[PDB]
A and B are shown apart, each in its own frame.
Chain A
Amino acid sequence: LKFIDTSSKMGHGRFQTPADKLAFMGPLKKDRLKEEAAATTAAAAAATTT
């Protein structure tokens, strides 16, 4: 066997793997937002301490 079509049957599967999705799909409002929230929370923590 040389390949398995792991793409979404949900219906018209572009991308086999969630890693292949990240390659084609560029900086979506998404994961980056979560990181941005975390940094904000740290700045808040730092202000309270000072």
Chain B
Amino acid sequence: MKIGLCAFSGYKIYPGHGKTMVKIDGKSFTFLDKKCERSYLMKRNPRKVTWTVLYRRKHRKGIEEEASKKRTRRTQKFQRAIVGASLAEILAKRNMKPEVRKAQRDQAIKVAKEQKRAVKAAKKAAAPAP
């Protein structure tokens, strides 16, 4: 038997202890006890009823435990290598510092000059022939 919460006064409803009303629609309202039942049957605003935990939260009475929970998560879990080049090989490319990287760059650019000049020249050679 499950301890429920009074949907107007917030008070815990220990086994049987009072009454639960289920509307036609059906919206289940749970009452600890008659005083609650009768006040809300009489159509009182729980927000103007200082006997509810509901008003007390709004009205800043008591709280403490609920207010302590909320703040701080950044989260950065991993590098993502496996398949492309079996882990070690991606780790090797990953590590090789800037100075060596600039070398690889510049060497490739130097090789590329010759092919660009060659094709420009070759097209310049080809054009006279017709």
Binary CB contact string for chain A from 12 to 37 against chain B (1 if under 8 A, 0 otherwise): 11111000100010110000000000
Complex alpha-carbon distance, A3 and B12, angstroms: 15
Total contacting residues, chain A, CB less than 8 A: 13
Complex alpha-carbon distance, A20 and B14, angstroms: 11
Q: How large is the interface on B (under 10, 10 to 19, 20 to 34, 35 or more residues)?
A: 10 to 19
Stretch at the interface among B27-35, B98-106, B109-117, B122-130: B27-35
Seen from chain B, the residues whose Cβ lies within 8 Å of a Cβ on chain A are 1, 10-12, 14-17, 32-35, 53, 56, 61-64
Q: A24-B53, A26-B62 are in contact. Are A5 and B33 (CB under 8 A)?
A: no
Seen from chain A, the residues whose Cβ lies within 8 Å of a Cβ on chain B are 2-3, 5, 7, 12-16, 20, 24, 26-27
Contact assessment for B35 and A12 in the assembled complex, using a CB-CB cutoff below 8 Å: yes
Complex alpha-carbon distance, A27 and B11, angstroms: 16
Complex alpha-carbon distance, A4 and B12, angstroms: 15
Contact assessment for B53 and A7 in the assembled complex, using a CB-CB cutoff below 8 Å: no
Residue from the list A7, A20, A26, A27 in contact with B17, Cβ < 8 A = A7
